[PDB]
mmCIF file of C-alpha atoms and ligand atoms in Angstrom:
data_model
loop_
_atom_site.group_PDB
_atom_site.id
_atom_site.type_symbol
_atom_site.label_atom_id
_atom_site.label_comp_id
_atom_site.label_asym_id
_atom_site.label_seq_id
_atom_site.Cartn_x
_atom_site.Cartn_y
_atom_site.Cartn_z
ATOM 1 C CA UNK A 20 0.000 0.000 0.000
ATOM 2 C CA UNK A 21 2.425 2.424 0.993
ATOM 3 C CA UNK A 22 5.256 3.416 -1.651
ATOM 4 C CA UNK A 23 8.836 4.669 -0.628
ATOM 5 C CA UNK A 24 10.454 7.176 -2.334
ATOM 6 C CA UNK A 25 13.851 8.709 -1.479
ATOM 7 C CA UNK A 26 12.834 9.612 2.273
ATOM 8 C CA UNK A 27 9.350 9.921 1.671
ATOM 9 C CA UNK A 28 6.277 7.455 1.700
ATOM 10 C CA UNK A 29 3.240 7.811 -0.309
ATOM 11 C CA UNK A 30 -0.147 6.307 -0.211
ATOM 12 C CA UNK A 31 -2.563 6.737 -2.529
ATOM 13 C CA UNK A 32 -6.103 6.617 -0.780
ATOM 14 C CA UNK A 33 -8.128 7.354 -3.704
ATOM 15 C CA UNK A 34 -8.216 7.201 -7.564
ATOM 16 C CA UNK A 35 -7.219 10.930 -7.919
ATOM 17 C CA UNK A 36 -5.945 11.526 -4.303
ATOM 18 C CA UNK A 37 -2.361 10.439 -2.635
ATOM 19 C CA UNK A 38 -0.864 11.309 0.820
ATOM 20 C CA UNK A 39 2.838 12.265 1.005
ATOM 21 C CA UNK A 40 4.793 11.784 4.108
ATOM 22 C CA UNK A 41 7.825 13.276 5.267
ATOM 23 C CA UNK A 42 10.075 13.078 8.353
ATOM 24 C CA UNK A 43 12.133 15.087 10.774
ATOM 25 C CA UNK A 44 14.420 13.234 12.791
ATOM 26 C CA UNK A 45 14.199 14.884 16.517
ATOM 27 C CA UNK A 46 17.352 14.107 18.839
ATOM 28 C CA UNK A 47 16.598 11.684 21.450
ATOM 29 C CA UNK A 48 12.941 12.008 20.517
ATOM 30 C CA UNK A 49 12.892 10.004 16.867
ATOM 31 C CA UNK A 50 11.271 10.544 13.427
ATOM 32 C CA UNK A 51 8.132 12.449 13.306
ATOM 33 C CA UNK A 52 6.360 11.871 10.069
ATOM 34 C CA UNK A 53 4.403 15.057 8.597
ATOM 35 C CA UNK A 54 1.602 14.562 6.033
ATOM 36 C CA UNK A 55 0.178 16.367 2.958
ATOM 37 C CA UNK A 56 -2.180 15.779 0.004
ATOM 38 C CA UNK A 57 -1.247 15.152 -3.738
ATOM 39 C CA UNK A 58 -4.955 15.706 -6.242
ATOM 40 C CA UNK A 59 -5.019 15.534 -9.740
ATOM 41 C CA UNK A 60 -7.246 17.159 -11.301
ATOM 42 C CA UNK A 61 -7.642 16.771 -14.679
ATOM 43 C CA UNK A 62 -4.172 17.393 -16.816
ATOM 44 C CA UNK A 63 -3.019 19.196 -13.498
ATOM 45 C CA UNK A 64 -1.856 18.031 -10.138
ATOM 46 C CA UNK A 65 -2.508 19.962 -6.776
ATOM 47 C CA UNK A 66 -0.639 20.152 -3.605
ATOM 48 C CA UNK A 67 -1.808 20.519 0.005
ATOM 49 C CA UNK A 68 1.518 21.428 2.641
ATOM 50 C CA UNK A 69 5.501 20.819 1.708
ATOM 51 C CA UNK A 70 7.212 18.678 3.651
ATOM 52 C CA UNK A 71 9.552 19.215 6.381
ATOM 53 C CA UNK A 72 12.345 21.017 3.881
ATOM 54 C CA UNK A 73 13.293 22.247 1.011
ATOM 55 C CA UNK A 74 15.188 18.851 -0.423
ATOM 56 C CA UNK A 75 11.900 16.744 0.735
ATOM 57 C CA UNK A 76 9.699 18.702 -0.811
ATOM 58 C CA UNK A 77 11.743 18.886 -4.122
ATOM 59 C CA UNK A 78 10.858 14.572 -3.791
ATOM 60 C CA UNK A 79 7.852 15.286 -3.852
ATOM 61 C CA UNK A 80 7.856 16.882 -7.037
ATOM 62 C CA UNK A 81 10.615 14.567 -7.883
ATOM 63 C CA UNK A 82 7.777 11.558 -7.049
ATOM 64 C CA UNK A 83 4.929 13.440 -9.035
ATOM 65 C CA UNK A 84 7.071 14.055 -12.265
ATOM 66 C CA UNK A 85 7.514 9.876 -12.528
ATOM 67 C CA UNK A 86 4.230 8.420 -11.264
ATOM 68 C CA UNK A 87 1.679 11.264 -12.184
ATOM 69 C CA UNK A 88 3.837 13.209 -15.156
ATOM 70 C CA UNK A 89 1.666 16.197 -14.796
ATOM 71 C CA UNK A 90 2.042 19.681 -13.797
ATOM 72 C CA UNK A 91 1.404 21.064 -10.212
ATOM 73 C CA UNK A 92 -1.184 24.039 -10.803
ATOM 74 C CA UNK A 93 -0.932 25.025 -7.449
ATOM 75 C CA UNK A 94 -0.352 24.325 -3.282
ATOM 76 C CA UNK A 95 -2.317 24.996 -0.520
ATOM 77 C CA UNK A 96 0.157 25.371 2.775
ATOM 78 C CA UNK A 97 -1.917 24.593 5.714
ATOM 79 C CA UNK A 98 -0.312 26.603 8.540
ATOM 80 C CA UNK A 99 3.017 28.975 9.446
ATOM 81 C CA UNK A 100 4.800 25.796 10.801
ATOM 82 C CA UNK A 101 8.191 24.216 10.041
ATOM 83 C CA UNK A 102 5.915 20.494 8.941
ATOM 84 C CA UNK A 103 3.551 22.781 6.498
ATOM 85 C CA UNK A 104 5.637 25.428 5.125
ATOM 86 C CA UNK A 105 9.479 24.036 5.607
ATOM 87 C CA UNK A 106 9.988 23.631 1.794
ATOM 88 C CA UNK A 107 8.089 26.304 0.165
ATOM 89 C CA UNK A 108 11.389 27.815 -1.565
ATOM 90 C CA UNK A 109 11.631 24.151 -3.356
ATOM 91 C CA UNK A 110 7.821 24.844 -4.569
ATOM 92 C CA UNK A 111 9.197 28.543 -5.804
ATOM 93 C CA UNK A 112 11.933 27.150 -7.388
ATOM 94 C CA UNK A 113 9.943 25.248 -8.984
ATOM 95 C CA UNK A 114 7.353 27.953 -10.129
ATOM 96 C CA UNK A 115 4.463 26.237 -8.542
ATOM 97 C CA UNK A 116 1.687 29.526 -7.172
ATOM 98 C CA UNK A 117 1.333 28.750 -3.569
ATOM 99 C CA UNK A 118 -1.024 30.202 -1.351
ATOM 100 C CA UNK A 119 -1.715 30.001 2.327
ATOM 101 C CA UNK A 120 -4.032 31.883 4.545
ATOM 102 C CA UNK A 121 -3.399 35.913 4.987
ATOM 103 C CA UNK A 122 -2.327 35.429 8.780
ATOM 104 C CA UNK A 123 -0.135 32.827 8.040
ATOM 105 C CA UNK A 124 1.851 34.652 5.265
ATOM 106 C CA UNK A 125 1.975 37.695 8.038
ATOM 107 C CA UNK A 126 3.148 35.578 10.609
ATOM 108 C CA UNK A 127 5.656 33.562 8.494
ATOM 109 C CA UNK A 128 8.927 35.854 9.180
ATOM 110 C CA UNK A 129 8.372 35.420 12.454
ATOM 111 C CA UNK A 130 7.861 31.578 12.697
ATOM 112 C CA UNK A 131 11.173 31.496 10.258
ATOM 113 C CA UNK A 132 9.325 30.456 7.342
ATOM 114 C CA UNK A 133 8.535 31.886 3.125
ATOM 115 C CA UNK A 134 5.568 33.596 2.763
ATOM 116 C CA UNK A 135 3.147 32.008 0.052
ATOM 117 C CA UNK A 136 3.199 34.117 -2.851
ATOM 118 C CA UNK A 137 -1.050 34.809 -2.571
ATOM 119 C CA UNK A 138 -3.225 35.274 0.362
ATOM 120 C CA UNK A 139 -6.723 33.647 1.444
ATOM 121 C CA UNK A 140 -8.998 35.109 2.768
ATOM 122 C CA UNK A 141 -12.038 34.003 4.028
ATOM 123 C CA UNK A 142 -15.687 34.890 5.711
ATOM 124 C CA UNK A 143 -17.375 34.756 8.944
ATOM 125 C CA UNK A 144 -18.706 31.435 8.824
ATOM 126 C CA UNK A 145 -14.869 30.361 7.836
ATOM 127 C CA UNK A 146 -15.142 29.692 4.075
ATOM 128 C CA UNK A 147 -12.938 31.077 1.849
ATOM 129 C CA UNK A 148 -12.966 34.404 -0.191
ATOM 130 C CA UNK A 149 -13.550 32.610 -3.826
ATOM 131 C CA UNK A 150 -11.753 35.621 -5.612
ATOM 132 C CA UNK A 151 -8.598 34.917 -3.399
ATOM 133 C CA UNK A 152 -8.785 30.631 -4.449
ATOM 134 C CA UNK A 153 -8.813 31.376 -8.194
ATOM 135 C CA UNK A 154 -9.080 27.878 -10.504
ATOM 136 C CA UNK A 155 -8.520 25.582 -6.811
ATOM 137 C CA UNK A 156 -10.425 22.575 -8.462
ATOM 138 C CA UNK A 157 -11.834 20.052 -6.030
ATOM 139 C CA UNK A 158 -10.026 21.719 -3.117
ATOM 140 C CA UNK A 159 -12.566 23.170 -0.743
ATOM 141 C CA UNK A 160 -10.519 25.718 1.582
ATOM 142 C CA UNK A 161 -12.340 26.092 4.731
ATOM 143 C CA UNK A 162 -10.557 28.488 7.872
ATOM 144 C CA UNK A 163 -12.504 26.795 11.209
ATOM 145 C CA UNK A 164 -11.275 28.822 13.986
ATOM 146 C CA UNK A 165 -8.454 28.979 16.044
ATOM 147 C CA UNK A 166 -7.373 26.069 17.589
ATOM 148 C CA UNK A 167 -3.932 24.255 16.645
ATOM 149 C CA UNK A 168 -2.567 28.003 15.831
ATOM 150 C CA UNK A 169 -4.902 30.848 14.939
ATOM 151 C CA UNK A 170 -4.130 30.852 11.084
ATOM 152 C CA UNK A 171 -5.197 26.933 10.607
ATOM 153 C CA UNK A 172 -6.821 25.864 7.740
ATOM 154 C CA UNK A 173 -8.230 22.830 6.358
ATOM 155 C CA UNK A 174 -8.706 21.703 3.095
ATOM 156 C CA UNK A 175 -12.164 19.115 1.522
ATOM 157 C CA UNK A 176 -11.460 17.400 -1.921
ATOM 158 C CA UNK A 177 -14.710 17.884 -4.060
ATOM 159 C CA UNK A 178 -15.601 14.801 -5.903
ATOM 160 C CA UNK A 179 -14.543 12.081 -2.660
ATOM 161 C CA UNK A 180 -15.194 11.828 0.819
ATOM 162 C CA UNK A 181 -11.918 13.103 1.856
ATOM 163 C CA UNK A 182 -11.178 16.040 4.012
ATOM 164 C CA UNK A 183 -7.934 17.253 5.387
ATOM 165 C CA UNK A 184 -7.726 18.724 8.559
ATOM 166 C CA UNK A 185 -4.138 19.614 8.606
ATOM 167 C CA UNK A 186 -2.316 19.816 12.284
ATOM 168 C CA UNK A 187 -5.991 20.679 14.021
ATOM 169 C CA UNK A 188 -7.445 16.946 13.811
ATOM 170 C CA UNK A 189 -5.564 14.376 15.776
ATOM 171 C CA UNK A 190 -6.400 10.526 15.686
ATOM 172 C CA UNK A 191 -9.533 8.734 17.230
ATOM 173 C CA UNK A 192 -6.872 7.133 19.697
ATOM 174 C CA UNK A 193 -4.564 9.673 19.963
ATOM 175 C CA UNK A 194 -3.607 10.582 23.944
ATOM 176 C CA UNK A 195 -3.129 14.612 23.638
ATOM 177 C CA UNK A 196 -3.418 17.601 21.295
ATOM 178 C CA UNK A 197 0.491 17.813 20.062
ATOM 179 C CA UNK A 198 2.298 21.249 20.563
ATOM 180 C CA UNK A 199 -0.334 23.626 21.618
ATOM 181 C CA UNK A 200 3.118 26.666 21.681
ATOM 182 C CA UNK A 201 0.843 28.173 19.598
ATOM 183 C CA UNK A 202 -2.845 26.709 20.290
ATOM 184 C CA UNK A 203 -5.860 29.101 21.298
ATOM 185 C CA UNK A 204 -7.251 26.452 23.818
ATOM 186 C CA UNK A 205 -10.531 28.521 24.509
ATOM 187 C CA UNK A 206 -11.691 28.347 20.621
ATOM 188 C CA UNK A 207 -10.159 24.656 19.733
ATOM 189 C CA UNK A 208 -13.192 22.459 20.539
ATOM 190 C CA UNK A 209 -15.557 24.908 18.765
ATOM 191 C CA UNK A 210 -13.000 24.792 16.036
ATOM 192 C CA UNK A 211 -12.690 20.987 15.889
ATOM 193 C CA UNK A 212 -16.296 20.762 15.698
ATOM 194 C CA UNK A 213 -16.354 23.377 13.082
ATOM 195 C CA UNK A 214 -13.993 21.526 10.691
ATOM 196 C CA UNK A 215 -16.195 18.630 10.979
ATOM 197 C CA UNK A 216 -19.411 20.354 9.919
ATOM 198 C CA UNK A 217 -18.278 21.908 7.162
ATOM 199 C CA UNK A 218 -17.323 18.191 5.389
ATOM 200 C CA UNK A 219 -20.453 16.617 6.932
ATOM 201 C CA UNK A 220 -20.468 14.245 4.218
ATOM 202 C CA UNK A 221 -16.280 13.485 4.696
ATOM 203 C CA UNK A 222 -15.731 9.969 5.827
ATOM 204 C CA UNK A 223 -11.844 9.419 5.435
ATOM 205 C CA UNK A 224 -10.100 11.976 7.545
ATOM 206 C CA UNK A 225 -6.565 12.892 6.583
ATOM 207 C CA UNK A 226 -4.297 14.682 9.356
ATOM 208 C CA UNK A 227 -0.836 15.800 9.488
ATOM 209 C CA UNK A 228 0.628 13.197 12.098
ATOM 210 C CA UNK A 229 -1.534 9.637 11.740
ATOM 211 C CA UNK A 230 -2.670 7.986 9.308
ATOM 212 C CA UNK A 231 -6.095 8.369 7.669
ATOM 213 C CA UNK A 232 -9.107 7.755 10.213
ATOM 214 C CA UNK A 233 -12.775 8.114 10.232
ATOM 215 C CA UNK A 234 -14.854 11.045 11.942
ATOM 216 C CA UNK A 235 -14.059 9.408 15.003
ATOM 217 C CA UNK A 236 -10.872 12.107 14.620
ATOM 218 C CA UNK A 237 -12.704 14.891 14.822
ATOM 219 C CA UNK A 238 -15.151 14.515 17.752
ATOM 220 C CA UNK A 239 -12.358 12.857 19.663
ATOM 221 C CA UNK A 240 -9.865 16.031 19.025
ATOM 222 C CA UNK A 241 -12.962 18.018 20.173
ATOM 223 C CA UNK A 242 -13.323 15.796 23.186
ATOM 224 C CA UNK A 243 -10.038 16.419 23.855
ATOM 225 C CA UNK A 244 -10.388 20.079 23.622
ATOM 226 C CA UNK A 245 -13.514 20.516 25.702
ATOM 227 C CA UNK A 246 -11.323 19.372 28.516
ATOM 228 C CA UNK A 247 -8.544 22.353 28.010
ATOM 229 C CA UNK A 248 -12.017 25.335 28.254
HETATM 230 N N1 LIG B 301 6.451 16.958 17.264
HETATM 231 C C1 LIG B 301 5.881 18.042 16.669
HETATM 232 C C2 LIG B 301 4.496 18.166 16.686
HETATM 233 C C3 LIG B 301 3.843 19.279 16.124
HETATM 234 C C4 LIG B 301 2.414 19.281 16.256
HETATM 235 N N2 LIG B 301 1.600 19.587 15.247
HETATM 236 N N3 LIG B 301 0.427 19.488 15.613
HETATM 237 N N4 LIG B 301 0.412 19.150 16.859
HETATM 238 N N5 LIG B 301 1.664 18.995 17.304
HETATM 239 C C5 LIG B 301 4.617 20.307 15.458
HETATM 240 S S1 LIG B 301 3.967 21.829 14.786
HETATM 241 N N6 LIG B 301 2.985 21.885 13.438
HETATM 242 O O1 LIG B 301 5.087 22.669 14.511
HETATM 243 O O2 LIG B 301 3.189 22.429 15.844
HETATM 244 C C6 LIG B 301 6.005 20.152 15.408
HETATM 245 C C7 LIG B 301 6.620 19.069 16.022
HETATM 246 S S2 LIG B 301 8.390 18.971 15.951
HETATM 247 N N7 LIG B 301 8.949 19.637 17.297
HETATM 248 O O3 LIG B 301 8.823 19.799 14.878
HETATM 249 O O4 LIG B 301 8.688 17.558 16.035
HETATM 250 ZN ZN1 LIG B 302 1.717 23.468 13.527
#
């Protein structure tokens, strides 16, 4: 099922849909893996989040080129964090258009990341500004709320029952929250629940640090959360 490929591993979890993993080897703590989303669309191929790097995220184009052979349109970064925006100079390079929310291309100098080259922006019930998503396809960019950091977005693939919810989702048996540095503990839970009701329909949940899970993710991340109000 899964493929490896230089230091990544990809999965395809749908005709048109493949998650790419990446990992960052912590001393004494070990290898955290980091996961995105690969769509084609069509004759063009979408990205949601680099990977760690620059040189990962260059395999990842690397991988697309040989199994896909299509062009990447565009990529969605997910958050101003190392896991979602560590290679966006490879994606430059490259001359892939990459966009991210407003807030996280303002807080990007400070978190020692790139900016995306275009902003989202997005209303009050948390979907995006379509103007500022030009020609996204199938990806459905939908801002829920503060919660892992307070310019987290999440991302639904029109056309499947997939729907990512970046670093704000954790696993149906996962024990904690991950870094909350960042985290606005008062909103998460409403945020959580947000994500979740915006992809009502979304049975496969995708997340940046387990594997794919059911909806089981999301009220259990929101479980979680309730207990940090
Ligand atoms: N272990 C880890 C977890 C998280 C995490 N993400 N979401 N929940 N926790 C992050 S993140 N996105 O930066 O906040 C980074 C790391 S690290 N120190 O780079 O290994
Ligand atoms: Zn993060």
């Amino acid at each position: 099922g899964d493929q490896r490929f230089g230091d990544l591993v990809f999965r395809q979890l749908a005709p048109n849909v493949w998650q790419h993993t990446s990992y960052l080897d912590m001393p004494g703590f070990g290898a955290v893996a980091s996961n995105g989303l690969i769509v084609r669309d069509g004759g063009r191929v979408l990205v949601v989040d680099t990977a760690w790097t620059d040189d990962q995220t260059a395999q990842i184009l690397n991988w697309i080129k040989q199994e896909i052979n299509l062009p990447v349109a565009l990529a969605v970064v997910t958050h101003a964090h190392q896991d979602k925006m560590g290679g966006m100079d490879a994606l430059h390079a490259a001359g892939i258009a990459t966009y991210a929310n407003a807030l996280s291309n303002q807080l990007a100098p400070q978190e020692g990341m790139v900016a995306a080259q275009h902003s989202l922006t997005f209303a009050a019930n948390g979907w995006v500004e379509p103007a500022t998503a030009p020609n996204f396809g199938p990806l459905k960019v939908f801002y829920p709320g503060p919660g892992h950091t307070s310019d987290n977005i999440t991302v639904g693939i029109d056309g499947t029952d997939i729907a990512f919810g970046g670093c704000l989702i954790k696993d149906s048996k996962a024990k904690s929250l991950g870094n909350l540095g960042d985290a606005d503990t008062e909103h998460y839970a409403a945020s959580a629940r947000a994500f979740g009701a915006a992809f009502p329909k979304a049975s496969m949940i995708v997340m940046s640090h387990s594997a794919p899970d059911s909806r089981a993710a999301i009220t259990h991340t929101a479980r979680m959360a309730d207990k940090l109000r």
